[PDB]
């Protein structure tokens, strides 16, 4: 099972839709620094 996702530059509706980050905006990879957007986090465990 390979990573699967869509590439930057193309954004997307929701956010995991790309390979890291796809805001309305356009798509983007994970290696940020100051820029903030990404912040998903499990509530429970699996």
Known sequence: ???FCKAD???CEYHADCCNCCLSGIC????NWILPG????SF???
């Open 28 to 31: 983007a990879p994970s290696t």
């Open 44 to 46: 429970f465990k699996i």
């Open 9 to 11: 530059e193309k954004p």
């Open 38 to 41: 990404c912040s998903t986090s």
């Open 1 to 3: 099972g390979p990573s």
